Structure formats: C-alpha cells, structure tokens
Design a protein around this ligand. Structure first.
Ligand code: HEM
Ligand SMILES: Oc1c(Cl)cc(Cl)cc1Cl
Length: 137
C-alpha cells in the first residue's frame, strides 16, 4: 500500500526521483521552462549535473516526508503551506502540481511493481486541494 510505497521509493530515492522527474518533463515539455539549466539536455546528460541529482533527491525527500505525515492520503495543512511559501514555487499554480501527479501515477502504473497507484492519485488530489486552500492560484 501507500506506506510500503514510501519505503520502496525511499530505498532507492535518487533513482526513483530522477526517473519520475524525467517522466514529468518528458510528458509535459513546457514545464522544463521553469528549470533553465535543464534546457537542451537528454535524460542521460541530466544524470551527471550535480544540481540535477541533488535537486531531485531533495524534492522527493520532502514529498516523502509530506506523504509519511499524511493520514489516509490527506496531507497536513502545514505541509501544503510550506510548499506554497517556498520562493522556488512563487510562479506556480495548482495545475503544475496536477501535472506532476499525473506523471507520477502514470509512472507507477507502467512500472512492473505493485505501487498503490490509486492512493498516490488520491494523495495528489488531496495535496492540490490543500495547496489551493493555502492560497496557491
Ligand atoms: C509535491 C511536489 C513538490 C515538492 C515536494 C517540491 C519540493 C521542492 C524542493 C524541496 C525544492 C528545493 C530543492 C533544492 O533547493 O535543492 C524545490 C525546488 C523547485 N521546485 Fe519544487 N516541489 C514540488 C513540485 C514542483 C512543481 C510541480 C514544480 C514545477 C512544475 C516545481 C518547481 C520547482 C523549481 C523551479 C524549483 C527550483 C529549482 C532550482 O533550484 O533551480 N516544484 N521543490
Ligand atoms: O522537481 C520535480 C520533480 Cl523532482 C519531480 C517531478 Cl514529477 C516534478 C517536479 Cl517539478
């Protein structure tokens, strides 16, 4: 289930974080514009820029912390607030996060593994609702 998925992802956090982030950028290429240093790089090229692996790991670490603190896939309002307030997320709307979760859920469904993809889909929806509540446009 969802708790075990957190453990699976944590076990190989950098690999999952990179793969899922790449699935996101490749599904939604317009989103690459927010990451000016990643423009004009292939999958394998990004996997060699320091900030890429370190970025992705840090993002997914936070995501895992938010997922672990959630109850029944509902995130804490305090965690949504953090996400809205981050200077790095100042130009974002909920639609950016919707895209993120669509990519993540698609990745999990395509995986050979027994991810609880329905719970990640719900988590994402619940997080998007909490982001709006916390004032994200
Ligand atoms: C639940 C989803 C997300 C979480 C947990 C999250 C978390 C983070 C964290 C921790 C950082 C800081 C990384 C660091 O300084 O090393 C970061 C930076 C950033 N986030 Fe997110 N984020 C999420 C979704 C998004 C989405 C959907 C976008 C855009 C589509 C986005 C755009 C960025 C940008 C542009 C940066 C700055 C990258 C840089 O340092 O150049 N984030 N985010
Ligand atoms: O920074 C991101 C990561 Cl590491 C993964 C995805 Cl799915 C999307 C975002 Cl914007």
């Amino acid at each position: 289930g969802f708790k075990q998925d957190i453990a699976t992802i944590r076990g190989d956090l950098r690999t999952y974080a990179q793969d899922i982030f790449l699935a996101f950028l490749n599904k939604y290429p317009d989103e690459r514009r927010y990451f000016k240093n990643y423009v004009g790089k292939s999958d394998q090229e990004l996997k060699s820029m320091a900030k890429f692996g370190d970025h992705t790991e840090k993002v997914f670490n936070l995501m895992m912390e938010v997922a672990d603190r959630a109850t029944d896939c509902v995130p804490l309002a305090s965690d949504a607030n953090t996400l809205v307030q981050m200077k790095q997320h100042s130009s974002l709307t909920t639609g950016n996060f919707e895209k993120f979760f669509v990519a993540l859920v698609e990745y999990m469904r395509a995986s050979g593994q027994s991810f609880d993809s329905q719970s990640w889909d719900r988590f994402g929806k619940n997080l998007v609702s909490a982001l709006s509540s916390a004032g994200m446009k």
